[PDB]
Specification:
CATH topology of chain B: Virus Head Decoration Protein, Chain: A
Number of helices of chain B: 1
Helix content of chain B: under 10%
CATH superfamily of the domain at 103-228 and 271-281 in chain A: capsid protein of prophage domain
Strand content of chain B: 15-25%
Radius of gyration of chain B: 19 Å
Largest sheet of chain B: 5 strands, antiparallel
Strand order of the largest sheet of chain B: 2-6-5-3-4
Number of domains of chain B: 1
Structural class of chain A: alpha+beta
Oligomer: part of a larger assembly
Helix content of chain A: 10-25%
Shape of chain B: extended
Number of helices of chain A: 3
Distance between the termini of chain A: 49 Å
Shape of chain A: extended
CATH architecture of the domain at 103-228 and 271-281 in chain A: 2-Layer Sandwich
Number of strands of chain B: 8
CATH superfamily of chain B: Head decoration protein D
Number of strands of chain A: 16
CATH architecture of chain B: Beta Barrel
Chain lengths: ~280, ~120, ~120, ~50, ~50, ~50
């Protein structure tokens, strides 16, 4: 606050402005048709050859399994949009029935770096200096300037990291894929460097299994990104066109009796502060 | 405009800024006068030989023309032949005004208005 | 952006029309295949020799190309290399569909789709 | 309304759209000053000599 | 000639249904009108201009 | 202010009023045609001329 002498009037201070960015959710429809060829054959929750359960009750079993499975797939798509918005700042919503649009969040382009840890002579201080430079450019461009506490590595990024060198975290102990390696103190000074390693593999839309984390790169992201998950309107006779998490639906055709079963939701994962992360590529 | 966008995407809606004008607590003096050229918003004006309101520009003619002595800051935009309400009082912001080329620094902008009711001061 | 307006004026926010598409009660069949060129919204699509989705244009050859048959009706625009979710069934409007030249009258716009599920009839 | 043979399905009718218009109000500030030069001198309903 | 109202003679008859995918909702009315003068000869028509 | 379901309720009420008024317009068109010429020519795309 500005000093003036207690005789003079005083000094007038300027203000600052806004930015507004608007978004739209993407729409999702998975379904299963239910033939007679799925209600008749045996399932594991059966009495092994004796029909103690009706085939109506076997229909109820396979319907409950399919509803649990659509819940599973909608949650997987939430995870995938979350990882895309955390890494790239843009999400590339492709699909078999959906053209490629590119919902950009306004990541600063200087945050998405490209360095190299393969040349001879790279030390442990060079890699930590690269991460610290990434933390510098995050703490400059951010609105609140929040220091980063986390560095999420891929598989080969952690391999190239260790091969050159030489409670909240207790909620991820039984869990496959994501393992807290350990807080390295180092010579950062501005931030502490927790290390995660993310090696989850999700099935792609071509069923060619890919990594949820870009494995040849480093993402570092604080919890001050503070995103909000979004859900648009469910364009359907059921629920009256409103907005929900997702919405299962069932109808049928008369002859032959082929019941249909469709869930539909409109997810979108939006960071409300996109300059609170960076994507550091370390390999080819 | 007939078909809605069923897809996903982003849209930039805009960026507001405040435009503070005042830098002090002096009183405010306003007057209306007919304009001769087109006048923008918060632009520095003078008076030509006809008594109109030409926006301010030094280096005008062997003889300093009456456009070279600035008088007041405009407030609402007008065309030629229209009249302009313009401030003659108060203490004003530096960069929120209409200054042209070769009048960039702070010292020349106060050297325009050393004497009047109008003072030009920085914000913080 | 920065300054509000104090004066008095007017303007139009704009206008809106409905664009009706359906004209009957057939079953609707959809599919997404990869496109070969830019396709507008509701444009009639063919399939070239590479299996892509070229938007329909007859008189393409002494034997005509497989672009000369028309198959689908697009629903969302896509460039080359993107896939297009189009229609294979239903009853569609005469006027809302994006045709092109030399296919302007009514009788040609049904003789395109004499055979398929798709039928193109007039709104009343 | 269109005539339709009782076998066949029916016909579809189009509909219409909207239009808008916007306006802004204009602003009015008259005022008066009041002096001792205006209060002091006489008003007509006042007897002569002594006011 | 429609199953709603059980094939009964009426003035107009609204009727609403839909399709389950996509959510498109058809809406139809049906009538069978005829305007008959029982005495047709009680009204003439005089064209006066060209 | 309107929900998407309430938009549908408004447009359904409007289309029902419009259907009622279209059948009434066809009634009055037949009445006028029969009063003028003593014969009505029914037409349309889905109907032969009688």
């Amino acid at each position: 606050a500005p000093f003036v002498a207690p005789n003079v009037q005083g000094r007038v201070i300027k203000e600052s402005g806004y930015n507004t960015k608007t978004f739209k959710p993407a729409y999702v429809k998975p379904k299963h048709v239910i033939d007679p060829n799925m209600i008749i054959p045996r399932q594991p929750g059966e009495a092994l050859g004796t029909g103690t359960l009706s085939i109506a009750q076997r229909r109820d079993r396979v319907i409950a399994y399919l509803l649990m499975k659509h819940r599973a797939m909608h949650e997987n798509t939430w995870e995938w949009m979350a990882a895309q918005a955390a890494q790239y700042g843009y999400v590339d919503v492709q699909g078999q029935d959906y053209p490629l649009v590119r919902v950009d969040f306004g990541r600063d382009a200087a945050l998405t770096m490209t360095t190299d840890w393969t040349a001879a002579g790279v030390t442990l201080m060079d890699m930590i200096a690269d991460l610290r430079d990434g933390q510098r450019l995050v703490s400059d461009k951010s609105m609140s300037g929040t220091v980063i506490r986390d560095y999420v590595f891929g598989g080969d990024a952690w391999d190239q990291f260790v091969k050159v060198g030489g409670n909240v975290t207790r909620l991820w102990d039984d869990v496959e894929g994501v393992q807290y390696m350990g807080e390295l103190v180092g010579a950062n000074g501005a931030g502490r460097m927790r290390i995660w390693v993310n090696t989850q593999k999700y099935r792609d839309q071509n069923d060619q299994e890919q990594f949820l984390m870009k494995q040849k790169a480093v993402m570092g992201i604080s919890s001050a990104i503070e995103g909000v998950r979004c859900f648009g309107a469910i364009l359907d006779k059921g629920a009256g066109y409103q907005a929900l998490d997702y919405f299962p639906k069932m109808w049928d055709q008369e002859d032959p009796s082929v019941e249909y079963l469709m869930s539909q939701g409109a997810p979108l994962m939006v960071p409300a502060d996109p300059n609170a992360s960076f994507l550091l590529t370390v390999m080819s | 405009t007939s078909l809605p966008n069923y897809l996903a995407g982003n849209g930039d809606l805009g960026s507001w800024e405040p435009t503070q004008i005042f830098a002090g607590e002096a009183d405010i003096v306003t007057e209306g006068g007919a304009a001769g050229a087109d006048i923008e918003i918060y632009q520095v004006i003078a008076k030509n030989a006809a008594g109109a309101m030409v926006p301010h520009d030094p280096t005008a003619t062997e003889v300093p023309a009456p456009q070279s002595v600035a008088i007041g800051i405009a407030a609402q935009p007008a065309k030629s032949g229209q009249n302009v309400p313009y401030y003659i009082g108060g203490v004003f912001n530096h960069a929120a005004l209409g200054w042209h080329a070769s009048l960039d620094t702070l010292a020349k902008r106060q050297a325009v208005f050393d004497r009047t009711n109008i003072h030009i001061g920085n914000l913080y």
